[PDB]
């Protein structure tokens, strides 16, 4: 603190600022999230200008109530500023590091699957999958690896499933499908033939490309 740099009045900037309201899409339960803080609107350079585009990454348990959804995470992009309220849209789903890493146990093969897909709208989504190989309750063998061919087959199946599930309906619809882990269950059901399998999750949904803006559609996700 004694060391000084060469370096070759409006104190307390929070008095120059106002609070807003994070409004999540109608897909979730706890529809209002929390508070966001922005500078007061100066003539040319409004408050609503430097807001639309902001990402609020929040826990999925703090939207649904139940803490069986604690490991999941959701990015929400601010779109329409109501005046005090700001309406968000789904931007990206995530897994927290403390579960993803937890589930990567040694002595079993992890199967990871990618896919890029358009929705029934024009949303380009890259969605990821993790599946692990299970010690089938009977086993004496201290491992339970899958053979490479089997793994490949599983991956293919997963990809197919993902393609089927996206391309068919809106991003909102996809989100709805995702929350009670239906897709995962479906995947599990599919892959019971190829290999036992366990801890099947869609980890990570990444948005890449969105259509125009379409205000009406966005609104139809609120009220």
Partner 1 sequence: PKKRASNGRNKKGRGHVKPVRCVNCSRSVPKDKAIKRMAIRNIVEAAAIRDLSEASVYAEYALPKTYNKLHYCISCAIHARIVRVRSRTDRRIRAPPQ
Partner 2 sequence: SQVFGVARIFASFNDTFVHVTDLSGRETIARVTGGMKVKADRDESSPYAAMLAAQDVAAKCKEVGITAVHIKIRATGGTRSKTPGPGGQAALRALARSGLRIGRIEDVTPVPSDSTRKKGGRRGRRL
Length of the chain, in residues: 223
HEC sequence for 47-77: CCCCCCCCEEEEECHHHHCCHHHCCEEEEEE
In the complex, the smallest distance separating the C-beta of residue 119 from partner 1, rounded to whole angstroms, is 33
* Nearer CB in complex with partner 1: 61/207: 61
Q: Which stretch binds partner 2 (CB under 8 A): 56-64, 138-146, 147-155, 206-214?
A: 56-64
Residue among 46, 48, 52, 59 that touches partner 2 (CB under 8 A): 59
Q: Sketch the per residue contact string, 87 through 126, with partner 1: x for CB under 8 A, - otherwise.
A: ---------x-xx-xx-x-x--------------------
Partner that binds at residue 102, options partner 1, RNA, partner 2, none, CB closer than 5 to 8 Å by kind:
partner 1
**Residue 15 to residue 10: CA distance in whole angstroms:** 9
Please list, residue by residue across 167-194, b when 16 or more beta carbons sit within 10 angstroms of its beta carbon and e when fewer do.
eeeebbbbbbbbbebebbeebbebbeeb
Which uninterrupted H or E stretch holds 191? Answer: helix 182-191
What residues numbered 13-42 form the site for partner 2, per CB under 8 A?
A: 14, 17, 22, 33-38
Residue among 5, 66, 97, 138 that touches partner 2 (CB under 8 A): 97
In the complex, the smallest distance separating the C-beta of residue 170 from partner 1, rounded to whole angstroms, is 32
In the complex, the smallest distance separating the C-beta of residue 70 from partner 1, rounded to whole angstroms, is 6
* Nearer CB in complex with partner 2: 40/118: 40
Cα–Cα–Cα angle for 64, 65, 67, nearest 5°? 100
Partner that binds at residue 110, options partner 1, partner 2, RNA, none, CB closer than 5 to 8 Å by kind:
RNA
Please report, for residues 54, 163, 206, 208, the alpha-carbon distance to residue 126 in angstroms, rounded to integers and kept in the order given. 20, 11, 5, 7
Which uninterrupted H or E stretch holds 39? Answer: strand 32-39
* Nearer CB in complex with partner 1: 106/212: 106
**Residue 69 to residue 80: CA distance in whole angstroms:** 27
> Taking the alpha carbons of 66, 69, 71, 76 in that order, is the dihedral positive or negative?
negative
> Going by DSSP bridges, is the β-strand pair 32-39/17-23 parallel, antiparallel, or unpaired?
antiparallel
**Residue 178 to residue 182: CA distance in whole angstroms:** 6
Q: Does 11 participate in binding partner 2 (rule CB under 8 A)? A: no
- Which positions touch RNA (CB under 7 A)? 3, 5-8, 53-55, 57, 75, 91-92, 100-101, 104-110, 112, 114, 136, 138-145, 147, 150, 152, 155-156, 192-196
* Chain residues that interact with partner 2, rule: CB under 8 A: 1-3, 14, 17, 22, 33-38, 54-59, 62, 78, 96-98
């Amino acid at each position: 603190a004694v060391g000084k740099n060469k370096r070759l009045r409006v104190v307390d900037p929070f008095t120059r600022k106002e609070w807003y309201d994070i409004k999540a899409p109608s897909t979730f339960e706890n529809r209002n999230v929390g508070k966001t803080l922005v500078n007061k609107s100066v003539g040319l350079k409004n408050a609503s200008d430097s807001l639309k585009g902001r990402v609020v990454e929040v826990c999925l348990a703090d939207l649904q109530g139940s803490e069986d959804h604690s490991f999941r995470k959701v990015k929400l992009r601010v779109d329409e500023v109501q005046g005090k309220n700001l309406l968000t849209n789904f931007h990206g789903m995530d897994f927290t590091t403390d579960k993803l890493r937890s589930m990567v146990r040694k002595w079993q093969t992890l199967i990871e699957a990618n896919v890029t897909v358009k929705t029934s709208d024009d949303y380009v989504l890259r969605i990821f999958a993790i599946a692990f190989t299970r010690k089938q309750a009977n086993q004496v063998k201290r491992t339970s690896y899958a053979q490479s061919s089997h793994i490949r087959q599983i991956r293919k199946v997963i990809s197919e499933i993902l393609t089927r599930e996206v391309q068919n309906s809106t991003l909102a619809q996809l989100t709805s499908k995702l929350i009670p882990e239906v897709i995962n269950k479906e995947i599990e059901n599919a892959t019971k033939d190829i290999f036992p399998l366990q801890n099947v999750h869609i980890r990570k949904v990444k948005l890449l490309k969105q259509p125009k803006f379409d205000l009406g559609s966005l609104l139809s996700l609120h009220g």
